[PDB]
Design a protein around this ligand. Structure first.
Ligand SMILES: CCCCCCCC/C=C\CCCCCCCC(=O)O[C@H](COC(=O)CCCCCCCCCCCCCCC)COP(=O)(O)O
Ligand SMILES: CCCCCCCC/C=C\CCCCCCCC(=O)O[C@H](COC(=O)CCCCCCCCCCCCCCC)COP(=O)(O)O
Ligand SMILES: CCCCCCCC/C=C\CCCCCCCC(=O)O[C@H](COC(=O)CCCCCCCCCCCCCCC)COP(=O)(O)O
Ligand SMILES: CC(C)CCC[C@@H](C)[C@H]1CC[C@H]2[C@@H]3CC=C4C[C@@H](O)CC[C@]4(C)[C@H]3CC[C@]12C
Ligand SMILES: CC(C)CCC[C@@H](C)[C@H]1CC[C@H]2[C@@H]3CC=C4C[C@@H](O)CC[C@]4(C)[C@H]3CC[C@]12C
Ligand SMILES: CC(C)CCC[C@@H](C)[C@H]1CC[C@H]2[C@@H]3CC=C4C[C@@H](O)CC[C@]4(C)[C@H]3CC[C@]12C
Ligand SMILES: CC(C)CCC[C@@H](C)[C@H]1CC[C@H]2[C@@H]3CC=C4C[C@@H](O)CC[C@]4(C)[C@H]3CC[C@]12C
Ligand SMILES: CC(C)CCC[C@@H](C)[C@H]1CC[C@H]2[C@@H]3CC=C4C[C@@H](O)CC[C@]4(C)[C@H]3CC[C@]12C
Ligand SMILES: CC(C)CCC[C@@H](C)[C@H]1CC[C@H]2[C@@H]3CC=C4C[C@@H](O)CC[C@]4(C)[C@H]3CC[C@]12C
Lengths: 125, 284, 110, 284, 284, 125, 110, 125, 110
């Protein structure tokens, strides 16, 4: 069946960069966008950005814009999210969620939020 | 590498406009095409050169008309017919219009051959109407649907099944749109324009009454064809240009052109139901 | 942009009777076509959040009948007709109508 | 038992669109109908079967056209003609279109009788054109206006007099809308569709040139009739369905369908002014 | 002495709507006008009375069509042709439509003279088609462009050159709009209406088949002419009235009427490309 | 001539319910909606609700919604307004005013506010 | 929704000279068609309110010429050209353009 | 070339009126509107009003509306601005700037602000 | 209506290196057609203000290449790639998209 698998947990020093990978299997990777979201310890789930994985028009959030990049790969059917300017509060659990539908004649964004990845946690010290 | 804006369209207006246009086209096309098929193929049992072209055009128009209820249901409610029916409907829709436009061009060319120099036009006309027409109109139409036969499938999102065409990247969409507009508009349009003008240029040498009838008829045909097809292809072309990132006026213009393409695609289907009226002058 | 508050923040409930959780948006979550999009997520500890109901008052396949949502305009809520021992976890309500999306505060069931 | 939302419409666009369409229809209809009435009734003094149908249709169209200035004034400014004129205008408007559509159906039936089996069609055709036509088209048209003759009156609100149709409940409105659409669309439409197809099916047995002329003409007539009438009746039907509380998409859709009904009702009046062109082929 | 509100228009819709309508009109008009000019003037070398009118009408339509690409470029992008080309384009545009409408009226009058009393119509018809036509249609058309030849110039604002008509006050604009609408609509319209009715009134005395053909043709011509021209002139008239400060509904109505005038001015150009189809019946 | 007649004054205990009747005479009752309004002692006139008396799509005000009902009768040409959850501040003068116009093709709401009823006062103790 | 204030709250006037009362709305009371709806009501004690002018600057039949209104946009006012002994009562200004309607504060003439 | 010339500096008593003239030369005066603007000592440039010099639909600003008038003259191609109710803070430098474009078919307002006059200063004491 | 603030209020710069001045509007200065209108004015003492760039990032004829503007949406700025001794004066940024127009606060270059 359809599923999304993320990478393992990571520990990093402040000021470094992290790369998180999201492999989607069981469906056509080039028909649904991917949104990356974060859950902080003792805080509500907060959105940061979305990549269309089809024409690659990524979009960011003002809280994180300017320090994160998103890059897809159709051949491996994978989504990568690179984060720089690492801080102390960035320790959290990152999730890769299917979001939106992209097509030649259907390009909406309110059809999604169905399947989530296993979720990977990153900490700083 | 830019800010994406999603399409916003007048769903409320579309939900009323598409069903009524589809109903008018369905009724008129079914009536006219069934009547002409009954007249030509079922009863005559002995056809001339123009009757075969008329029958081919009618078959193409009927094939296009058959798929209209599926489009109406999709416009009104969710898709409820499955992946295979989605593929079949898309294939028939792609085949029918290509076949009709190429038959238009072939009828124009046959008129060119028959009118200008008819002294030695027996064998070429017979060969063109017997053998060449198939490999000319039907085979390329079937071949051009391989991308449609491959990349068209239903997508599951929330509850709404979507019968749409899915392409792995914008380049595939662009190349296919350019090929579609190029073939459909440029080739038959140039053929007809360079054909009918020469025909009526040659007519005026020794005939006084056929010349004015032909001048009225060719202008009617050209006006109808262009008024039916040009706005749709113009919308497709400018959409492709803005997809190639050589047109940058924001993307409110993008929503406007998408609405224009949808409305004009709905309107341009009148060609199938209006063809039997236009081409009732072939035998004279 | 849209901000939500969930009520109550903590709802301890004894096993055997129904419970309710209500959240209201800052503005009307009605799209241009007259439809509304709001979904409710349940997250058990150690697991990824699970989508209980996708469109308000409409639930997915594979979940018990106990969960059911209702609401309109600005006010939406979810009621569990019977509390089971496996219905403990965090609950959120999120909307997908405006860009960008926003999650709920989070409700704990004890 | 639900939240009422009041209609909101584009008054600014209507105040320009209704007068110009009404003026075009008034001019063309007055010209054509007066000319055909002068040709047929005033000068011939000896009429055939088809001439009586033409005269009836022209009289109905002229009766409809006469009331157009009142509608234009109502659209532009306040009603200033009183209760009795409101009732008379509504009655004439209801009578004329019913009469015209039933005459369309009767002409179709007369063609059916005259073309298929003309060997023994003398007495039935003569009886149909002499006696049956009156009780067929005029009497039911007059009878159907009793609700219009009773429930139509002017209402005083602020300063603006309103010449409108007032019904004590939604059920009365629904029943009358369903009866109107049922009769006007279903009956003559089915008659024409089951008529002309059989006519040209029988024509092709032994005639080679009349068949193509009939195939062109019947398709023209059907296309014109359906393109004129279908969107208006579709709007009325979906409005009745949403009034029966079986269609619940909010009520922005309700405002959209009300605007669609208004615009299409304005547009559908072209039938009266366009009939004299279509039905100039009756005598041949 | 009131609050000014500046015009706001749907630029996004116009940038797609004007080029496609202009392209359709350009293609159809070039085709039809070139074909009829080739048929009539280049090859016949011996013309009758109606052929001269046809040639004049075709020349006027071609002159109008030539300037269409400049209008399309102005609608899409900035003006890039200079002051002299602006003046020349405006002059040609003003001349061509006046010439075409006056030729319409003259053809109507020639038909009146030829049909009603042809026993003694040789000399007046010959004189009208030989000498009077020039000073009737061409000289007044040239004279009416002096305000256009004087007051039309390009204006520099920011980067965008504006090829527009500049008048020192609203009175000049009003007087010129009233003169334009008065001449173009009132004079030929009254001539045609008082002409064709009398023609077919006289036809029915002793002819039975020509009468129905004329009844169909005159109604077609009147319907086409009025449907093409009336909305544009209605918009101009109500704009002049609101410019005279006798119509005060705010100025949202003013923006609406400006959009209506723009769209209807774009649509009314179909007359030039549609004339060759309508007037192919002159010789019979 | 056209007129609206209300019922007599009433005294009620807190927590009870009141019914007020509004008989309209002199015109067609099924062509104009009816709005019920309240005037408190030493306070401006405040709206509460409206009933269309034609399709019966009543509408309320958030201050009073949830405790009032409106019901019409065409045969007697009367409008009834039932109020429950009676409180101490509900003592006031209630008026029945013709409001709006309802028809097959005209269903606006800015044509009215012309004729008022005689007005009935209710008190609590 | 729309809130209004009337000025002045109390206007004592001596018999024989004109008076004025002005009220302004929270927002512009202009409908889509460019028309504006605002009416003024006079209530004598013991009587139901009486409709003096229905649309701004337009009065009903059956009232003296002394009352006349004027205004536009957001600002509207009513002037009585001559004060008579029978012109004592409460005065209100109300709008019917948006749902729901709102009455004025109330002005007393002494 | 195109230019705008204003009048000389002026000194006036409080409560008096001032007239400022703006002669435009080098272009067609009846194709561009004229906006009058003020610069106070030690303050940003502040707009007051605009006159179309073609149909004469002048428009004002609420800060100054009710005490200023604008009148054009095509024959002399001049713009005049009369100011009454003179106060102490009205001492400033007034500028006459071409603003907007006016034509039979082009009547916008975002094409202008190009050429300024020499600017005249007025003081009060 | 639209209010602007310029940053910095005073920018003293040494001759020979580039400088920048940034101003942001209260709301988005995007017209209906997708174009934006914002211009920058330089006023030398004793002179009338001079129009450096008319539409954002587009300069007039007759000025050196040193001035150049950039920005979009709500944020706009002007950068001088090289400071010359004759580039001392007041700088303002103004918009012409909404009625009425509004000038900038004013920046002094030392
Ligand atoms: C060759 C035979 C041709 C026969 C043609 C018959 C079919 C014609 C049907 C005409 C229906 C009238 C359409 C006007 C309806 C306007 C409704 C309305 O209020 O539109 C509003 C918005 O307006 C629009 O977008 C509609 C304007 C574009 C559609 C115009 C179509 C023109 C008709 C072309 C026919 C050519 C022949 C509603 O807004 P929202 O959706 O956001 O709520
Ligand atoms: C059989 C003979 C047919 C001859 C047909 C001639 C009559 C055609 C007249 C066409 C006039 C052009 C209409 C476009 C005008 C648009 C104006 C505009 O700005 O519309 C705005 C809103 O747009 C609309 O609602 C108009 C769109 C719907 C109307 C479209 C009608 C299509 C014409 C069908 C003709 C079929 C033949 C203004 O908004 P508001 O009212 O809220 O201020
Ligand atoms: C005699 C031969 C006649 C052949 C006629 C062929 C040409 C017909 C072309 C039809 C194209 C369909 C037009 C509808 C496009 C609507 C697009 C849309 O979304 O419109 C929106 C606004 O709607 C409008 O203003 C468009 C409605 C008015 C135009 C309607 C024209 C009716 C066609 C008349 C043809 C008569 C024959 C976009 O808003 P903004 O500009 O503010 O972003
Ligand atoms: C998968 C879909 C698109 C395949 C469609 C193929 C069918 C419907 C098409 C392909 C070629 C067509 C045939 C081509 C030529 C003729 C000869 C003519 O005198 C009668 C019709 C007839 C016999 C056509 C009938 C329809 C036809 C058989
Ligand atoms: C499909 C829609 C959008 C466009 C329809 C355009 C075509 C079908 C219309 C546009 C103009 C029309 C023509 C206008 C005038 C005449 C002259 C008349 O004596 C015969 C019919 C004829 C020749 C019409 C035939 C149909 C026509 C060619
Ligand atoms: C109150 C209104 C609706 C009543 C309308 C009734 C009048 C206008 C109608 C009713 C029946 C009609 C008549 C029906 C039949 C014929 C025979 C025909 O060869 C000439 C016209 C003529 C004589 C009609 C003239 C108009 C007519 C008299
Ligand atoms: C009233 C409006 C909205 C719809 C008008 C639809 C009717 C009147 C129009 C739509 C398509 C038109 C047809 C299009 C093409 C032709 C072919 C030509 O050789 C003769 C005219 C003819 C047959 C036209 C007659 C008029 C026609 C049937
Ligand atoms: C400055 C512009 C508007 C001047 C346009 C004038 C030219 C294009 C016009 C003016 C009068 C016209 C001529 C008037 C009469 C005839 C006779 C006809 O049998 C052939 C065309 C011909 C010869 C016309 C050709 C075009 C013409 C010469
Ligand atoms: C330019 C646009 C906006 C208006 C076009 C209007 C004219 C060209 C259209 C409107 C209605 C049309 C007519 C409708 C019906 C018929 C009957 C048919 O048997 C011959 C063609 C004929 C006579 C059409 C000719 C073209 C026509 C007259």
């Amino acid at each position: 069946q359809v599923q999304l698998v993320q990478s393992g947990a990571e520990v990093k020093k402040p000021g470094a960069s992290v790369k998180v990978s999201c492999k989607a299997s069981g469906y056509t990777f080039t028909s649904y966008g991917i949104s990356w979201v974060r859950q902080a310890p003792g805080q509500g789930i907060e959105w940061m950005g979305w990549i269309s994985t089809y024409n690659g028009n990524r979009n960011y959030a003002q809280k994180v814009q300017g320090r994160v990049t998103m890059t897809t790969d159709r051949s491996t059917s994978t989504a990568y999210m690179d984060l720089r300017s690492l801080r102390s509060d960035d320790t959290a659990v990152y999730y890769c969620a299917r979001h939106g539908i992209t097509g030649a004649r259907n390009y909406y964004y309110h059809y999604g939020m169905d399947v989530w990845g296993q979720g990977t946690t990153v900490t700083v010290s | 590498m830019k800010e994406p804006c999603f399409r916003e369209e007048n769903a409320n207006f579309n939900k009323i406009f598409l069903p009524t246009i589809y109903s008018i086209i369905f009724l008129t096309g079914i009536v006219g095409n069934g009547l002409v098929i009954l007249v030509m193929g079922y009863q005559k049992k002995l056809r001339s050169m123009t009757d075969k072209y008329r029958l081919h055009l009618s078959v193409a128009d009927l094939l296009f008309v058959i798929t209209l209820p599926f489009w109406a249901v999709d416009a009104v409610a969710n898709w409820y017919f499955g992946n295979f029916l989605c593929k079949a409907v898309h294939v028939i829709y792609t085949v029918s219009l290509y076949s009709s436009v190429l038959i238009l061009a072939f009828i124009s060319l046959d008129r060119y051959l028959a009118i200008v120099h008819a002294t030695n036009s027996q064998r070429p006309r017979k060969l063109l109407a017997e053998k060449v027409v198939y490999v000319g109109v039907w085979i390329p139409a079937l071949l051009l649907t391989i991308p449609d036969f491959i990349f068209a499938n239903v997508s599951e999102a929330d509850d709404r099944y979507i019968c749409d065409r899915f392409y792995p990247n914008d380049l595939w969409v662009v190349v296919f749109q350019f090929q579609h507009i190029m073939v459909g508009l440029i080739l038959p349009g140039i053929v007809i324009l360079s054909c009918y003008c020469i025909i009526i240029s040659k007519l005026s040498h020794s005939k006084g009454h056929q010349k004015r009838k032909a001048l009225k008829t060719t202008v009617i045909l050209i006006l109808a064809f262009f008024a039916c097809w040009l706005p749709y292809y113009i919308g497709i072309s400018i959409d492709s240009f803005i997809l190639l990132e050589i047109i940058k006026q924001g993307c409110e213009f993008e929503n406007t052109v998408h609405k224009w393409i949808s409305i004009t695609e709905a309107l341009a289907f009148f060609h199938c139901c209006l063809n039997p009226i236009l081409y009732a002058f072939l035998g004279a | 942009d849209v901000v939500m508050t969930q009520s109550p923040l903590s709802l301890p409930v004894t096993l055997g009777q129904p419970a309710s959780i209500s959240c209201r948006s800052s503005q009307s979550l009605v799209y241009t076509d007259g439809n509304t999009y709001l979904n409710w997520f349940q997250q058990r500890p150690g697991q990824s959040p699970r989508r209980l109901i996708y469109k308000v008052s409409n639930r997915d396949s594979g979940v018990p009948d106990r969960f059911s949502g209702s609401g309109s305009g600005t006010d939406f809520t979810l009621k569990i007709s019977r509390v089971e021992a496996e219905d403990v976890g965090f609950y959120y309500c999120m909307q997908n109508t405006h860009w960008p999306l926003t999650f709920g505060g989070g409700t704990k069931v004890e």
